[PDB]
């Protein structure tokens, strides 16, 4: 399971948060898009598989992943693509900050940076983003 | 090279602007191509990179848009050293790299990614050696 994640979108202030959660350690991946298209989509996609070993994502299951554009990244970028908690929990982050920027995309990058680094329980805690790449190294044998 | 440091440096192409943050030890590569190299750009990019990966210092190369107030307000928020100035063939594999794959897309941007994933996953060193994805996290795993 190093190589698998979940794919949602938020509606926000009329515009649309892609987040990319990897599964096993709570990491996240985010962007602000115009619009819920396949293009933007497939651009997700691809700019994560070339950051991340992407093996499998799950989706909602909407139109914006049945375009014929992200079938040819994932073919190409050997996505295979399938089918809250942590979902829930950044867009209490994005409130948090919200005020402290003037567009909602800073304040969603604000609010990933936060939840990546935060530690989780007290001293001997990881975070989100100390669990991703424990889990890919050691793998890596 | 330490494991914090990254390497910021942009790139020109079909007149449009490709940001790109090299993590000096691994090799490992991010890139976005964005409208022009404004200060709110740099700043959503540096952001967008110290939320993703451990961002201790940045060097620049001093353009206009790092001397911006929001750039810098940024790697103060993010807690990223910014290190103007600090000394390029990366620019030079990148390019040849989206030469190649650069008809299977019907935009730059997107050839631009699948130009990064490709240097990421390429194996240096022959068959026993690493990806600049392997090496990365293999220098900055903690535990
Ligand atoms: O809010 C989008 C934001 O991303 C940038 C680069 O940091 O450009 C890219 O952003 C998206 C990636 O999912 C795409 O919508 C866009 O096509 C891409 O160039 C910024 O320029 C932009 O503000
Ligand atoms: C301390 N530290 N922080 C990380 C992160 C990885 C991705 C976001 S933050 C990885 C390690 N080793
Ligand atoms: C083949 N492979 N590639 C990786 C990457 C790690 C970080 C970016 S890509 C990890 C493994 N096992």
Redesign the pocket.
Known sequence: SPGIWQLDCTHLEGKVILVAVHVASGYIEAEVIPAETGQETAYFLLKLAG???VKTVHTDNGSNFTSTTVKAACDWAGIKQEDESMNKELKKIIGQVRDQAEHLKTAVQMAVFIHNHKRKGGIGGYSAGERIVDI?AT??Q
């Open positions: 950051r991340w070993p890919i793998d890596i």
